[PDB]
Design an enzyme around this catalytic site. Structure first.
Site, mmCIF file in Angstrom:
data_model
loop_
_atom_site.group_PDB
_atom_site.id
_atom_site.type_symbol
_atom_site.label_atom_id
_atom_site.label_comp_id
_atom_site.label_asym_id
_atom_site.label_seq_id
_atom_site.Cartn_x
_atom_site.Cartn_y
_atom_site.Cartn_z
ATOM 1 N N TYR A 137 70.112 14.743 25.559
ATOM 2 C CA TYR A 137 69.691 14.632 26.864
ATOM 3 C C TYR A 137 69.055 13.218 27.197
ATOM 4 O O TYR A 137 68.410 12.390 26.418
ATOM 5 C CB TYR A 137 68.478 15.571 27.084
ATOM 6 C CG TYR A 137 68.660 16.885 27.420
ATOM 7 C CD1 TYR A 137 69.531 17.785 26.624
ATOM 8 C CD2 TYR A 137 68.495 17.374 28.804
ATOM 9 C CE1 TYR A 137 69.795 18.900 26.953
ATOM 10 C CE2 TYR A 137 69.019 18.583 29.244
ATOM 11 C CZ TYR A 137 69.252 19.442 28.403
ATOM 12 O OH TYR A 137 69.977 20.769 28.557
ATOM 13 N N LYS A 165 74.225 14.449 28.042
ATOM 14 C CA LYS A 165 74.052 15.204 29.430
ATOM 15 C C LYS A 165 73.061 14.398 30.368
ATOM 16 O O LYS A 165 71.811 14.448 29.873
ATOM 17 C CB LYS A 165 73.284 16.819 29.210
ATOM 18 C CG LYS A 165 73.064 17.716 30.381
ATOM 19 C CD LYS A 165 72.396 19.034 29.851
ATOM 20 C CE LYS A 165 72.179 19.801 31.232
ATOM 21 N NZ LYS A 165 71.277 21.091 30.931
ATOM 22 N N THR A 167 71.023 14.170 33.085
ATOM 23 C CA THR A 167 70.342 14.897 33.982
ATOM 24 C C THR A 167 69.354 13.764 34.828
ATOM 25 O O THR A 167 68.075 13.773 34.641
ATOM 26 C CB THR A 167 69.372 15.800 33.507
ATOM 27 O OG1 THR A 167 68.833 15.426 32.082
ATOM 28 C CG2 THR A 167 70.609 16.824 33.018
ATOM 29 N N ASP A 191 73.655 18.777 40.286
ATOM 30 C CA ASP A 191 74.760 19.251 40.896
ATOM 31 C C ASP A 191 74.970 18.498 42.217
ATOM 32 O O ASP A 191 76.044 18.436 42.746
ATOM 33 C CB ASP A 191 74.864 20.742 40.951
ATOM 34 C CG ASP A 191 74.516 21.477 39.808
ATOM 35 O OD1 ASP A 191 74.471 20.921 38.855
ATOM 36 O OD2 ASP A 191 74.581 22.819 40.025
#
Ligand SMILES: [Cl-]
Ligand SMILES: [Cl-]
Ligand SMILES: [Cl-]
Ligand SMILES: [Cl-]
Ligand SMILES: [Cl-]
Ligand SMILES: [Cl-]
Ligand SMILES: [Cl-]
Ligand SMILES: [Cl-]
Ligand SMILES: [K+]
Ligand SMILES: [K+]
Ligand SMILES: [K+]
Ligand SMILES: [K+]
Lengths: 296, 296, 296, 296
Positions: A137, A165, A167, A191
């Site tokens: 992450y 990932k 984020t 998203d």
């Protein structure tokens, strides 16, 4: 050796029954529903899965159920991250036993840890994962861990790390990561900027809203590959009309409610302290479920 | 009915043995050590106790052990907070069974919750506590929850709330809380400003560094009551010389190391991902232990 | 009536001579250089122009010079913003006298102002602008003003507002602004995410790095219109290789140094307290100037 | 050689007349009013003085007027800080010509500057001040400049620096600064924690609210010296009841309004974009003025 990790993967929700226990039947149906959406993989036991209001044995139960439904059909990524390294290693050993294709762990949070402590934490989990790759992450907004670009470069270089990932809504850093690591599997985590994150360098994504409309995110991937700029923008607009509503109602419970109106989940509850959805939002959420089903 | 909660209470560390299991013998000795320091109470299972790298059954074990050593001797406050309301309620029911005088719960973290969700979380825990009062948190730095003054006023008014653990360096808000609630039990949470926090309105404190030098914080209380401004400032200077070193070395493990050199803890380790203390700091930590013991 | 405001516009630098006075000859040459790059407009007296280390009469001097060179050739936007409303109104009246096509004002900073105070500030400047439209700011990173989406919607609805300069890396908000205002002139303010910001809804941009490589940003606009996803990404990669170096060396002085090696500016200095460029960076900056000139 | 700088000094407001021009008669009366309050000095042209909505010549005018009224009667500190070093040097040269006892400069803001650029900025201003000492800032909340403790130590060691204006609510850092610099003149900048800031190490203060109630802050100094803990706390409570109201109404304009009801200022306006005081607050502000006058 890590190319099977690239793609669009829902961050799976964990269905609960009316008493806050895991709803195993609805979990299995949700896995099959995401498979039938054409997704490339599922990300299990993440924050979206309400991991941090579950015990270790509950998280292992979910991992094992999802592997039973999905192994060999789509890529399986197990989020094993806890604050504790030993707890994370237990979940990683389990994911290995169950046949997952990768593990993932959020940067350990609440307590301040040095960067070397983060690296040693990932190294320990990778060892317990016993040969399947690790997804690291970046996450700074929920975890409070605000990593530099140079630190990211050392994380994605750790032996056994196969993906990041990302984020973060910082698409300068997204582009810098891609430029420094042209082969890295790089998931867009926000998203609401998916199309722009792909354009900035992500080659896939992991997202909670993919559970109700994966074909839109798959269609954005396709539109950008095809050269259909307007189609990518139109699809993102429609995604964000949905995300707007999910933010207003509460994201996880709004997603679960939509899935209940799609006949996927028997019960749309989150665990306390998440409240239930307010009655005034049910009409909009049912209309959204109808619209999404019609769109298929 | 809540005046027994006022005072100076160490946030108890949880000793671990060489394999990361709870060291029950050293836990009992640490409780007796704090009692013999003249403290007014102990705060068990807080962040300082490494609660968030322990399972529920491990936390219950610690609560039960500490009640065995301390009940009826000093005030016992059980930190029962988890992200999950149901997990927090289990720990609160246990604290009640074991004879604690109060429970406490950190504002649930990681996921964004509305203020009403926070209130309902506290209400549920208070109910499970079955008649012992609740200590609420303000904590914004570690939890990421940044509460308004008006929200604080509604929290400390919740039926069953008997105190506020003000883990904030904002001494304007400390003074505003005191002015709005002249009778409220109000704990200073930042050890490094204890004297100034008392002056701003706190009437006690809960702190991790009290485990190695409680008599200094008790002496600051006394100096301010006596009118010895210079003595309060001198004691805080000496506390902060210690806190400076603890920050450099790592606070929990530095505290545990000092306690090991005071013959209180057999093993000074924290759980992973906390690293062990670096060898280069051992001389300073042993000299500090010697100095503190001589000072008694 | 505001469509002439859409496009790619450099945020003009203000050249200074060796004594920190405005270099009027190099200012005129920089204006002509940007015109010959094919830009749609120039943005004068912004932060990039070092407005906040200039007096009002110095800023008016720059405005008047740039209008002399550019009026009727490219769109002219005058940044008139100061903390003071009356100072901003003086600059707006001047921009009107000189024939600018629009004014712009940063959200007034340093002191906390209410949102209504911001609106009244813009209303006063619009009135003094005497019929030319206003470009509002979002800017939260440099100004410390962190505006909501609902507040943005009221700003872009103010009578006389014709555009928004979105100096934010939040491309969810960019998309929300576009979805709420399909006709709004919407400038991308973070050069390092230009391609992604256009995809998220911006229909142009204002940027400091456009002074040395406007054809790349014009080419990104064109690539996205054409459907050449890879070309947009490749151009942004090359822009960000440049921005990486500019951040390392200092952005305004690095830009001015590159322009000096392109024979545009006689002297590449910024005003104190900006230091001069370190000697160790001159080779890279000269090589960059050579590369950019060859690329044309 | 810097001991005359220690004490309680109002951050002077700048009175404006009904048209936003400096009200020179009310400025002179405000200076005499603060002198008659028994203050140790006045701090002129700071943020509280609305420096950042004034031109350089307006700021020089204020400096010269205040020196005419106060020189030789109380300590005179001139805040000369601008973003521009050359502008700051002009104001420092003027303060020297007018007979000020010290200059001060806020850390230059809006643009990111390196720490060495900050130091060179202060060095240049000190040189232009031609022998009177410099008061440095910490200020992180309004300026956005977030300095480390090690950097503070190098600032207060710069040749010619005689004091630090600590405009921070971090009283751990306050104590660390005092412990590292036992002789440093150290001003508390947050009025709402004055008593606690003195206890943490400040030996004086500069504050905007001292213009209407300096005798309370002088009384806190005295109470802490005397050993009257309760009196210090009571006075701070009363100060913060006032600060609460000033925050609700707008601090500078509320202060100016109170002074107008005390017959000190003819006109209580701030410069735009500060709005006037809302009519609904006038009763409370007039009652406050009456109460403060009665209290003398
Ligand atoms: Cl099924
Ligand atoms: Cl096993
Ligand atoms: Cl013992
Ligand atoms: Cl039981
Ligand atoms: Cl020319
Ligand atoms: Cl004129
Ligand atoms: Cl007078
Ligand atoms: Cl002169
Ligand atoms: K979110
Ligand atoms: K701390
Ligand atoms: K920047
Ligand atoms: K303030």
């Amino acid at each position: 050796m890590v190319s099977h990790l690239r793609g669009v993967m829902p961050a799976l929700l964990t269905p609960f029954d009316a008493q806050q226990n895991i709803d195993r039947a609805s979990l299995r149906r949700l896995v099959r529903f995401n498979i039938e959406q054409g997704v490339d993989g599922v990300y299990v036991g993440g924050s979206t899965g309400e991991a941090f209001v579950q015990s270790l044995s509950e998280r292992e139960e979910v991992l094992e159920i999802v592997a039973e439904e999905a192994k060999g059909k789509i890529t399986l990524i197990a989020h094993v991250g806890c604050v504790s390294t030993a707890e994370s290693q237990q979940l990683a050993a389990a994911a290995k036993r169950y046949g997952f294709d990768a593990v993932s762990a959020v940067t350990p949070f609440y307590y301040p840890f040095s960067f070397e402590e983060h690296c040693d934490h990932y190294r320990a989990i990778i060892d317990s994962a016993d040969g399947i790759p690790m997804v690291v992450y970046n996450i700074p907004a929920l975890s409070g861990v605000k990593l530099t670009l140079e630190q990211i470069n050392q994380l994605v270089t750790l032996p056994g790390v196969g993906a990041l990932k990302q984020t973060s809504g910082d698409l300068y850093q997204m582009e810098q990561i891609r430029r420094a690591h042209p082969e890295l599997v790089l998931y867009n985590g926000y998203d609401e900027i998916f199309a722009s994150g792909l354009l900035a360098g992500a080659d896939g994504g992991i997202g909670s809203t993919y559970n109700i409309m994966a074909w839109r995110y798959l269609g954005i991937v396709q539109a950008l590959k095809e050269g259909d700029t307007a189609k990518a923008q139109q699809l993102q607009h429609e995604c964000n009309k949905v995300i707007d509503l999910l933010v207003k109602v509460g994201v996880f419970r709004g997603l679960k409610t939509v899935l209940h109106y799609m006949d996927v989940l028997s019960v749309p509850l989150c665990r306390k302290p998440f409240a239930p959805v307010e009655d005034k939002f049910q009409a909009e959420l049912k209309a959204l479920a109808q619209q999404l089903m019609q769109e298929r």
